[PDB]
Structure 1
Amino acid sequence: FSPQMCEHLRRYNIIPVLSDILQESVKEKVTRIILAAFRNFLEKSVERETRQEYALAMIQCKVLKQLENLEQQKYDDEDISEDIKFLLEKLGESVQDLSSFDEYSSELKSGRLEWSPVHKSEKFWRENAARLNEKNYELLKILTKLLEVSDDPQVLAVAAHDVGEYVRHYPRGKRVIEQLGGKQLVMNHMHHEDQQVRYNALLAVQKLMVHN
């Protein structure tokens, strides 16, 4: 309830530990208070650090996908049916407000290329069709550069996914990666020993050659 206590309790792993209690949902009163605990957390913050409680808490966890079927169920207590619609509208904006490319530009320029819902969302890639060319097609060339020099056991699959979704939405970008030689990099990285970077680069190399 008190606003300054919300930034006191955030020095922990609270909400994904709490969402692990939410996915059980056997008692049918623990879910009515742990959804109210999600609301009283999210409503009473006077800061921009509610986004700290999405990345730890909401978008990067198995809670937002669970809240879709939480709406589908038939609860009787009227505050619950407004608790889900408040959380769905608060987290409905929370997926695309960093799904801006800025953040993605904050991800790409600073590096580390983490797993984020901005990569899997197609409304991201619906928007930034020409935005790599708005950055003079360096913004792609900075992405294949970090794909080149580094081994990256986790974020190379993210980097292989990023060149794949752009190519499906701009057919002239297939000629762009040919000038950079990034296709032969994906040819090498699809033969990697790790299976996640193999599966992502196999989809990446098969998106390059849909039509020739």
Structure 2
Amino acid sequence: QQKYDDEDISEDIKFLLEKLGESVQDLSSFDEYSSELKSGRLEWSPVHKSEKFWRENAVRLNEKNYELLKILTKLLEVSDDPQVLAVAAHDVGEYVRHYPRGKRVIEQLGGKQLVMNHMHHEDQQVRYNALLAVQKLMVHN
């Protein structure tokens, strides 16, 4: 927003904006994403909130027998780390936001009870995210 007479500043900021756009777009992917989600190391990557992943690439989480969703349920049951729990819960919520059929699948699995159990928790941030996830489940339910 701050313009300057120096052509260097304007050209470099434009060029960096474009290149950073390419960088974030390339970073936005499913392969390394599913690799880390499998390994259980859930850092707060900005790809998780990337809307385009859930608009077009959402069905990739539906692996064989919903392997990704079930193993995230298992890892939520296993790990106690608030930040990985929050990351997994947010990913599950944003996935179920668009597929009301997978919502019935998840309800049949019973992960809603896991999220209800994690709702009351020492980390009120995890509680708040669990409320958001349960709410996305309360969509039409």
1:177/1:183 contact within 8 Å kept: yes
Distance apart, 1:198 and its partner CA: 1.1
Distance apart, 1:134 and its partner CA: 3.9
Question: What's 2:82 paired with?
Answer: 153
- Give per-residue Cα distances to partners, 1:19-70, cap 9 Å, x unaligned: xxxxxxxxxxxxxxxxxxxxxxxxxxxxxxxxxxxxxxxxxxxxxxxxxxxx
Residue identity (%): 99
1:96/1:124 contact within 8 Å kept: no
- Stretches of structure 2 lacking an aligned partner (at least 5 in a row): none
Distance apart, 1:133 and its partner CA: 2.1
- Give per-residue Cα distances to partners, 1:77-110, cap 9 Å, x unaligned: 1111111111111110211212211121121122
Distance apart, 1:167 and its partner CA: 0.8
Distance apart, 1:178 and its partner CA: 1.1
Aligned mates of 1:96, 1:180 — CA distance in 2: 34
Distance apart, 1:189 and its partner CA: 0.8
Question: What TM-score results when the alignment is normalised by the length of structure 2?
Answer: 0.93
Distance 1:177 1:99, change over 3 A: same
1:132/1:139 contact within 8 Å kept: yes
- Give per-residue Cα distances to partners, 1:166-200, cap 9 Å, x unaligned: 01121112111112211111101111110221111
- Taking only aligned residues, the RMSD between alpha carbons, in angstroms, comes to 1.3
Question: What TM-score results when the alignment is normalised by the length of structure 1?
Answer: 0.63
Distance 1:136 1:97, change over 3 A: farther
Aligned mates of 1:127, 1:147 — CA distance in 2: 26
Aligned mates of 2:4, 2:64 — CA distance in 1: 50
Query: What is the 5 A alignment of 1:167-186?
Result: 167-186=96-115
Aligned mates of 1:194, 1:134 — CA distance in 2: 31
| Higher helix content, 1 or 2 | 2
The number of residue pairs the alignment matches comes to 141
Question: What's 2:56 paired with?
Answer: 127
Any idea what SS the aligned residue of 1:130 has?
helix
- Stretches of structure 1 lacking an aligned partner (at least 5 in a row): 1-71
1:190/1:199 contact within 8 Å kept: yes
Larger Rg: 1
